[PDB]
Amino acid sequence: KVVYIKKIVISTHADLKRVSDELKSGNIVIVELTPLEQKPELLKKIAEQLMTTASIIGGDYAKICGSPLKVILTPPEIKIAK
Amino acid sequence: KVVYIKKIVISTHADLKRVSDELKSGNIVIVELTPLEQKPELLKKIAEQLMTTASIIGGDYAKICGSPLKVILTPPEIKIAK
Numbered sequence A, B: 001k002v003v004y005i006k007k008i009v010i011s012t013h014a015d016l017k018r019v020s021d022e023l024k025s026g027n028i029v030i031v032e033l034t035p036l037e038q039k040p041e042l043l044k045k046i047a048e049q050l051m052t053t054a055s056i057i058g059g060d061y062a063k064i065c066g067s068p069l070k071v072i073l074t075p076p077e078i079k080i081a082k
Helices: A017-026 A040-058 B015-024 B040-056
Strands: A003-009 A028-032 A058-064 A070-076 A078-080 B003-009 B028-032 B062-068 B069-074 B079-080
Touching: A003 A017, A017 A028, A017 A040, A017 A070, A040 A058, A040 A070, A058 A078, A058 B062, A070 A078, B003 B015, B015 B028, B015 B040, B015 B069, B040 B062, B040 B069, B062 B079, B069 B079
Parallel strands: A003 A028, A003 B079, A078 B003, B003 B028
Antiparallel strands: A028 A070, A058 A070, B028 B069, B062 B069
16 A cells, blocks of 8 residues: 655644554654754654654654754554665 | 564675665665765765665665665565555
């Protein structure tokens, strides 16, 4: 089957379900966290929720740019090799 | 089947086949081009070869960080949505 790489900008709290929904569909998500770059504690909270999102779903998590600040989340079928 | 996201740092010319080989296997490749960041014309040549690599294989291509300079290449089964 075909998998998509989708991008999502996290600004509001609703954007977190959007991410979850995509991973559930089997897609990869590049998450851009720029709106939160100047709110360290909130950034920390959101980042934590994103890692949880990946783990619960069986997928992976990793930072991919520092600027813009971006993390990548994968569905269980796709692994971040090391 | 399981797909992997692999990272490859392009320094030498040999590293381009490594990338090709991974895409052929069905994997996604994050390519880091930092060794070439200070060699604009060479960077342009390599970037062109990478786009060709993706197209020939039926896959996708896109920049993902500015620093480090990174592009992502996908195999045919995985598309960069828009």
